[PDB]
Design a protein around this ligand. Structure first.
Ligand code: 2MR
Length: 304
């Protein structure tokens, strides 16, 4: 089995670099954030432009959906996160506390908490209802590139340019694990596997690694792409074959067989760095997005 992802839609509208794309958990929508200070909403299946959500004062590095698909959270260079009601476009809360660019964010599965990571080297945990910061974790000694909750929300994983991935207990704020990788190259992205047993980490030595984070063992290594400068999203694709999906600094989307580590497809079409990819929750659809010289988002579909 290889997949046969083919380009179906190209989504144009952002006027600066796209930073993040994410499918809604209900599969209906794609949300995009950009250096143009905007969030856009698009139809997940047809790429149809839906609406623009605005209000940040500087560029946005990340956006993320609540579990019920009703809210977004965005992370901005203006040092804030904003919580958005997607249907009305309202800014429900502005989360203030970080002392530098907010880079990454996510809801927990219950979606009563938001985790954020910042250039201020901290990870912050927030109450969605009140907008109050509940915990500030002294997480890293360099900017925080990613933060993600596990499947039951009891753990947080963070990555940083300091070369570390750390595992945090959500309830206590305690650091439970530090993962150490030879020569400590900057970690540019991390997330949990859908089942929560592993983490997938990207490092700025053109490498993705799948870790058993409890045992602290590297189980798989994926290479062949280019990633030495930018924080590029990576994904588990689970709707068809079991793949790993990433952007790349050679303007391609890469797809690997998870088990064998072989490159099974490379998707051509973008004209600048592919900074973000996302995988649709029930259908074999990949969304990708590119930097300043391209500015477009692409929807690719496969039969497996
Ligand atoms: C939140 N996570 C990201 N990547 C993992 N964001 C995209 C990179 C944004 C960065 N300012 C840039 O333009 O490179």
């Amino acid at each position: 089995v290889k997949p046969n992802y083919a380009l179906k839609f190209t989504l144009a509208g952002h006027t600066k670099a796209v930073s993040s794309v994410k499918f809604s958990p209900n599969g209906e929508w794609l949300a995009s954030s950009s250096a143009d200070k905007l969030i856009k909403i698009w139809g997940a299946y047809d790429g149809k432009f839906e609406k623009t959500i605005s209000g940040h004062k500087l560029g946005i590095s990340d956006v993320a959906w609540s579990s019920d698909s009703n809210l977004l959270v965005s992370a901005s260079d203006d040092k804030t996160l904003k919580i958005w009601d997607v249907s009305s476009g309202k800014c429900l809360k502005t989360l203030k506390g970080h002392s530098n660019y907010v880079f990454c964010c996510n809801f927990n599965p219950q979606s009563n908490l938001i985790v954020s990571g910042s250039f201020d080297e901290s990870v912050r945990i927030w109450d969605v209802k009140t907008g109050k910061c509940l915990k500030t974790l002294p997480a890293h000694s360099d900017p925080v590139s990613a933060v993600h909750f596990n499947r039951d929300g009891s753990l947080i994983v963070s990555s940083s340019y300091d070369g570390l991935c750390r595992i945090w207990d959500t309830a206590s704020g305690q650091c439970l694990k530090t993962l150490i990788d030879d020569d400590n190259p900057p970690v540019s992205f991390v997330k949990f596997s859908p089942n929560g047993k592993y983490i997938l980490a990207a490092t700025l030595d053109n490498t993705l690694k799948l870790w058993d984070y409890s045992k602290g063992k590297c189980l798989k290594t994926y290479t062949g792409h280019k990633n030495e400068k930018y924080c590029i999203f990576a994904n588990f694709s689970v709707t068809g074959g079991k793949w790993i999906v990433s952007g790349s600094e050679d303007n391609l989307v890469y797809i690997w067989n998870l088990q064998t580590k072989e490159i099974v497809q490379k998707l051509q079409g973008h004209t600048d760095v592919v900074i973000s990819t996302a995988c649709h929750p029930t259908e074999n659809i990949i969304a990708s997005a590119a930097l300043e010289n391209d500015k477009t988002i692409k929807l690719w579909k496969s039969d497996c």
